[PDB]
Amino acid sequence: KSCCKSTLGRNCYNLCRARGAQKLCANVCRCKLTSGLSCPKDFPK
Amino acid sequence: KSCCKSTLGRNCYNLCRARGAQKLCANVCRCKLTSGLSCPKDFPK
Amino acid sequence: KSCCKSTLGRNCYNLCRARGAQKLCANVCRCKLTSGLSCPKDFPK
Amino acid sequence: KSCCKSTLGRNCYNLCRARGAQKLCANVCRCKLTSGLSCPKDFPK
């Protein structure tokens, strides 16, 4: 699951995924990938 | 597939998975992960 | 995809998968695992 | 996702996948595998 800090980072990640991998997109859009089924409180977007 | 020993361990695993990986949750909730499509007799929950 | 040589090997594999991994079950039931979407002529079951 | 350069390469890849892996089929049919959800402009088929 990807978990972003802001709505900005969420749009960033989704657009990035058109051509990039999860892991690279998470980094550039300041998002976090988690193994859990829910996002932490601090990465709710 | 995850296979737990008790109902307690099952609730434990399911809640744990909100933020943890299968493998760490199995350990802490005393469950077992199997490659089979069914659970052994001793981990039926 | 699993591809078996006989119907016997097919029942064997399916039952085996209740508790075993694809790779171990293929071996014991004399089946083959393929990356292709179809089975070879010689493993049609 | 697989992304091919021509329709020819697309038919090539799809037929190849009946018996081959993604990675080998991409190579022989001159296609590219991408982690992105969309294909680059130069591999649109």
Swiss-Prot record, chains A, B, C, D:
Q: List the disulfide bonds.
A: C3-C39, C4-C31, C12-C29, C16-C25
Q: Which residues form a coiled coil?
A: none
User: Where located?
Assistant: Secreted
- What's this chain's function? Thionins are small plant proteins which are toxic to animal cells. They seem to exert their toxic effect at the level of the cell membrane. Their precise function is not known.
Indicate the family of this protein: Belongs to the plant thionin (TC 1.C.44) family. 4 C-C subfamily.
**What is the protein name stated in its UniProt record?**
Purothionin A-1
Q: Which organism is it from?
A: Triticum aestivum (Wheat)
Q: Which residues of the full protein are shown?
A: 28 to 72 of 136
